[PDB]
């Protein structure tokens, strides 16, 4: 059978032009009183999946 | 060439002969043979196939 895409991951990451993965940021849902404006501003920005994590999840997104 | 029934019939029983028609010729057919004996019309048909 075909390999299945991990649907939860596919809702959270995007394949970029270089083949990397763009991701959202944790700590961006609530309890914003617990975080400085600097933290909130810089968690507003997207990031990429780290090398160690990418090797762990890459097979789960082969045909995303 | 296609339709040459009697040439095919007379050739096939010889243990050293393999018979094909110009439109059914495979790589294994050719490589097996030491020699290829082709009629003129068979060669023309092959050149139309390829």
């Amino acid at each position: 059978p075909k390999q299945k895409t991990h649907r939860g991951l596919a809702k959270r990451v995007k394949r970029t032009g270089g083949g990397g993965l763009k991701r959202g940021r944790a700590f961006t849902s609530h309890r914003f009183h617990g975080k400085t404006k600097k933290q909130r501003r810089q968690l507003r920005k997207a990031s990429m999946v780290a090398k160690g994590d990418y090797k762990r999840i890459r097979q789960q997104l082969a045909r995303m | 060439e296609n339709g040459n029934d009697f040439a095919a019939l007379s050739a096939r029983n010889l243990p050293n002969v393999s018979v094909v028609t110009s439109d059914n010729v495979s790589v294994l057919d050719v490589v097996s043979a030491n020699k290829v004996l082709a009629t003129q019309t068979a060669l023309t048909q092959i050149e139309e196939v390829l």
Partner: protein, 146 residues
Amino acid sequence: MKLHELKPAEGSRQVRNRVGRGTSSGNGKTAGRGQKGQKARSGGGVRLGFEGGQTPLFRRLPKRGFTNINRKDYAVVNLDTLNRFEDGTEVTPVVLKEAGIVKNEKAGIKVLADGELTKKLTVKAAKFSKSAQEAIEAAGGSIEVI
């Protein structure tokens, strides 16, 4: 070639490695699995992305966005690809399909100004980037939205 003298191209074919066939092969006994644990077991191992119970990376991250039902994606053609046609050519989605340049036009052909156009053409496409329109007409051609 000869059936008694076949030879593959170098490096085209390799010998399979068989584990558990003696110690001197280097994969005897434990067959490369090491000693005990879950990964030594037949069918052993955790599912992809499992971090042994640490909250997995994907659970840590938010879901984002939505997919537009009416989303339209256009087949991109750049000017350097239009240099392949002679001056005065009528470049059409049909012409591009026959040329094999665009096999799938998707929602339509869109022309983009990546390279430099050098031939005069009358280009027909679903959409034109503003720069592509200028380049085509600067070359003395003309564009038409279909």
